[PDB]
Amino acid sequence: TIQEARKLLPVHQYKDELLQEIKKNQVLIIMGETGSGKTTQLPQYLVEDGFTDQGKLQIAITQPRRVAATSVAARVADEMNVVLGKEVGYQIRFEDKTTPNKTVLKYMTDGMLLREFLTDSKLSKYSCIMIDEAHERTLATDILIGLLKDILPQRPTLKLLISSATMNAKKFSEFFDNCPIFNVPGRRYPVDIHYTLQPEANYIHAAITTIFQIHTTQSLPGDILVFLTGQEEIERTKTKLEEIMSKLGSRTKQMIITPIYANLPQEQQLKIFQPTPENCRKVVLATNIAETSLTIDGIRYVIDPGFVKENSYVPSTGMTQLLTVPCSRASVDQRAGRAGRVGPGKCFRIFTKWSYLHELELMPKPEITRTNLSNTVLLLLSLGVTDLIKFPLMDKPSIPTLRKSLENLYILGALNSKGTITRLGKMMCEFPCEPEFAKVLYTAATHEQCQGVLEECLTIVSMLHETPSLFIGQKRDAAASVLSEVESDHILYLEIFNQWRNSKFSRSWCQDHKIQFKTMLRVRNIRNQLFRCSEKVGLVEKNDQARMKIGNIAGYINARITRCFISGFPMNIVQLGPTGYQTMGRSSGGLNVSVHPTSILFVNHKEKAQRPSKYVLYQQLMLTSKEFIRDCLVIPKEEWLIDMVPQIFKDLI
């Protein structure tokens, strides 16, 4: 059952030894491996012991990812014998599946407890707070241990718990004034680690061939796990492992392919939890270790090419390009240790043994050293943190990274010239999004040349949160079905949601125009969150009045929206140089960026004979073969560029 396979987890032998120590200490550090019974069973012991005091106080468990917050909360809701959300909830950025008077245990992310400091400074709803995966060193975790350190002398009733690996757990003890380290080891079974003989020409073709020689030439029971970089690599792998499986037929053995990534339907997430039938081999595809953890945990094989896609800070502008890097030697050893949970597993590594020892970093760097920090500093200045150097967090950001996040909040007008947090800066804290998405919604309701288009800018901003999951097939086939001639990628996203709204949110509409219906229900939910937050601020009333003054005509609306994204993203403006599109700014010369072929602006150069635009506004930069602009926006006039943010473009233009 599920009530007896929980006893075989390594934390049940350490049950009463650990409940006695949390009653003694205020902060305690639990040390071990990823998913060794803790964060699934240990929050269940705290509820039954009575640390919540009859549901008056809550318990927050802080997962680092969006995917690991929901899946682990659903897995505990099976064990608790509660439905979900009533007694065991979760809190994503845009999803709050809790009820306020019954939720006792809740599994949120790192950004959503960090946002909880606004409405409550001392975190008075919570009696126990557990930070999970503190060795990952995400930015919203590295700040959240600094802010909880400042409120430890003021509330002694709070109890803090930190889960980390067996390598970083001493540095967290040095940080919390010689904190006691409790140790929960796992059943370490030996894993036989294999390396290839040559540098591989492709890590996907070698990873598909590796699954087949494990499937054919090895016996059951053993389930396969593959670590892939992104969701575009997983679904390219899942379909191609479905094509070659079809030619085999019923000859070999059953293969259940079970991917783990974000924005997934419930019929695929129930395939995570239920065990395999006999004469069946589950092949799990995922990206990080913390989501692959299972209670039954029948997996015994791991394939790793050793790559993580992560947001590297751009040296020219203030933003973070998405870049794919070799992962660290400590992170590879977390992946090989996934096979040795129940039995003696095997680990297949696409890189050679030489590149393991002499080309990988021995320990992964923290995220806080190479990031935007624009949402960070505006968050700390709103909480009363005046000094940013003397703030006592453990790894501190560099000064060129920190001065760029100050002068980007000054171009947005979120910081005063005297350094105080302005009313626009107090407004950007209210919206559950990036502070540059909050400038676009402010410009669309209040600006003297741009008011009237908040209803069209709550649509396009909601479409940009769910860009890669919108459509089935290619986008150049789906774009011609909704509107025959679009020029920029933002107006196309305005046209898709309006026509879907005009068809009364039809399931049959999205299948005709090659659009995923499950994505558009989330975009419709993000829009309901961003519109409800614009009512409390007052940008709704300021645009209902600005629309009754001027009833705008559709020839001007696409020019209002273009200006509303210049004022929110002024550094993401790219000029057509003599060699190509080139990043335009006062810091560095340029990056010689090209357009991603998924964007609709690449289609208008090949399919159409239109000349290339002079100014293009992107939402996201990425580097695979060269730098690629995604989510384009065409700016045909220099006059729209100076008249919105003149503090940059007066000297440049």
């Binding site: 696409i350 080309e359 150097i389 100050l406 002068e407």
Partner: protein, 58 residues
């Protein structure tokens, strides 16, 4: 040249003026804000770690 922006270390500014951006510019705000505290590769994606489809024989 040598300016120090102090913070509110213990009613509002609705809009920032274009006069205000010519007095204290963007580049001057990055340096002078920290004076209050006293401050004064390419992965083609088709390769592997070391670098430089139908597996059916038919």
């Amino acid at each position: 040249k040598k300016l120090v922006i102090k913070l509110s270390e213990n009613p509002l500014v609705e809009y920032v003026t274009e006069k205000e951006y010519n007095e204290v510019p963007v580049e001057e705000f990055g340096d002078a804000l920290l004076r209050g505290m006293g401050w004064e590769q390419i992965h083609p994606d088709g390769l592997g770690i070391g670098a430089k489809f139908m597996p059916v024989v038919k």
